[PDB]
Amino acid sequence: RKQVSDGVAHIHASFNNTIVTITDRQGNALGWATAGGSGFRGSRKSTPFAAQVAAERCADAVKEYGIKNLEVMVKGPGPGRESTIRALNAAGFRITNITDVTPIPHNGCRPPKKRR
Amino acid sequence: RRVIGQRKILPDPKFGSELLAKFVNILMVDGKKSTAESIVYSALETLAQRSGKSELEAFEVALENVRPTVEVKSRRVGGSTYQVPVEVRPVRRNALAMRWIVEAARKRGDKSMALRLANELSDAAENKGTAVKKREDVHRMAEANKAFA
RNA sequence: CUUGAGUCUCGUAGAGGGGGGUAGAAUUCCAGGUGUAGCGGUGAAAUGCGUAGAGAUCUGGAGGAAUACCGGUGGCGAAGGCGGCCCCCUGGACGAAGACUGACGCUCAGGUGCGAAAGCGUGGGGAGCAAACAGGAUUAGAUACCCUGGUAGUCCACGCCGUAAACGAUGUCGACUUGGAGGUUGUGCCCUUGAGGCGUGGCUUCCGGAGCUAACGCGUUAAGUCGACCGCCUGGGGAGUACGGCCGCAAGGUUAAAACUCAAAUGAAUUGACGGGGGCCCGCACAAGCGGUGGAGCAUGUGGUUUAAUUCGAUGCAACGCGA
């Protein structure tokens, strides 16, 4: 729609999945596409190359807003997820800040059990 | 762990060419020095009969386009066998070039070894034959897949 | 008689307990938007939210849930245990000086009290998370992992029970003990001559010295040398088991056997193998290059086959131009 050229990106670096959402500084959704939404399933979707191709198929379709500079923060214990932000940097999204806002529990919610 | 210097070969007693002595040794089998000399010297004289000048640099200008620059050497690190492309030394480039030159002279399709090799020298001088084919073949397998380099 | 024990004055550190709300991330719900075909989770998959339009963030709010950042073998307590924030009542320890009592003290079967978690009764909340549980997906049964959901349950008051590797497997009160380095609470002397060095109190953590122990090991906090008191053990299995007594809404708990079986059971520390761990090197063992065995014909041996008999031995790198 409008011209942005400078926004922000929030990622959900899950264990077996990856979510991305780009926003223009106020909560408007611009770009978003997971791994399991482009015919990519199985462990093939669990590779950093899947993050590469997710970034690519986001960027080639969301340039309707014209973003050149981008803010981002790495979020989640995702294996190899700086690759997708470097692909954004390679997708024409000239990066401006790389930080981490991973929400750590404050022993407010009891952590669930894991594989025995 | 062992390391030594290259074998002290005697240069060619006629033209004084150590790199060509290395070639006439690469080619020689069963130690038939006399017949091997009598065929290669005659074929290189047939090279003077081919162009009509003092053929001494023609060998070098022909081999300038059959020397490789990239080689693959398999090294299994990290599960599978990686290819690890590595540069080839010029002193080994000359050897490999002469190897590709000699590994196509026998299947030329001429009357005799001397004749077919005299023809193949001029052939590789203008970038044709199995030698140049293998040169391009090794140039494309290595460093064109730099993701592994 | 006053050193033990207490009493007085002033301060130090504080996650000891109630009662109250309080702020931030988060995450279920509610509404408004902006935007679009997807989200959601598996070594894969499917289940499950979506075309009046799904997630996801923006604005705000309800719900309950515990306080990361200080966070520290860091502090506190008789033990069991305590962490956002503040207050009232207090529970305990320590420090700086000066003064009083007359032995008032330590231990302690019963008894009383406190007492991890799990397990109940009454009255409530229960957002998220999580024993059981429906069901889906590979499936001659998966009832076992993996995934979204989920009952008590964690939470809140009043009451039930008293069991743990409740361990420092080391009961309590004391007398005399060579050092170093730090954790934490002190404050004196002389010049605070930017946070100054020496002596003087405590509680502690990592090493070792004589000493003790079967060894490991303990070693100013003793498992060192001694004084006073309480509990526990007399081979293993049955077994902390039946029958009892008491307690208990229930689970059962406490005290607590015998007939029968065996000749062992058990702690430390060497020397050993497990079969892969983990690391360091040799050998044409590999990678680069040469001719080769395997393609073909012929000589020769081996197993089969054949026969009246086709004489015997030999068999993975070490059997097959081997005895010959």
Give the arrangement of secondary structure elements.
This is part of a larger assembly, with chains A (116 residues) and B (149 residues).
Chain A: E1 8-13, E2 18-23, E3 29-31, H1 48-62, E4 69-74, H2 82-90, E5 94-100
Parallel strand pairs in A: 1-4, 4-5
Antiparallel strand pairs in A: 1-2, 2-3
Chain B: H1 18-27, H2 33-51, H3 58-63, E1 70-71, E2 75-76, E3 81-82, E4 86-87, H4 90-102, H5 113-125, H6 130-141
Antiparallel strand pairs in B: 1-4, 2-3
Helix pairs in contact in B: 1-4, 2-5, 4-6
The structure holds one RNA strand of 324 nucleotides.
Features:
part of a larger assembly; 2 chains; A: 116 residues; alpha/beta; 5-stranded mixed beta sheet; 2 helices; 24% strand; B: 149 residues; mainly alpha; two-stranded antiparallel sheet; two-stranded antiparallel ribbon; 4 strands; RNA-binding; ribosome
Verbal overview:
By secondary structure, chain A is α/β, with parallel strands linked by helices. Chain A has one domain. Chain A is built from two helices and five strands. Chain A has a five-stranded mixed beta sheet with strand order 3-2-1-4-5. In chain A, helix 1 (48-62) runs parallel beside helix 2 (82-90). In chain B, helix 1 crosses helix 4 and helix 4 crosses helix 6 (130-141). Chain B has helices spanning 18-27, 33-51, 58-63, 90-102, 113-125, 130-141; strands spanning 70-71, 75-76, 81-82, 86-87. The longest helix of chain B is centred in the first third of the chain and has 19 residues, at 33-51. The radius of gyration of chain B is 17 Å and the shape is globular. Chain B has 149 residues and is mainly alpha-helical. Chain B has one domain (1-149). The chains hardly touch. Chain A binds one RNA strand of 324 nucleotides through strand 2. Chain B: Belongs to the universal ribosomal protein uS7 family. Chain B: GO terms for molecular function: mRNA binding; rRNA binding; structural constituent of ribosome; tRNA binding. Chain B: This is Small ribosomal subunit protein uS7.
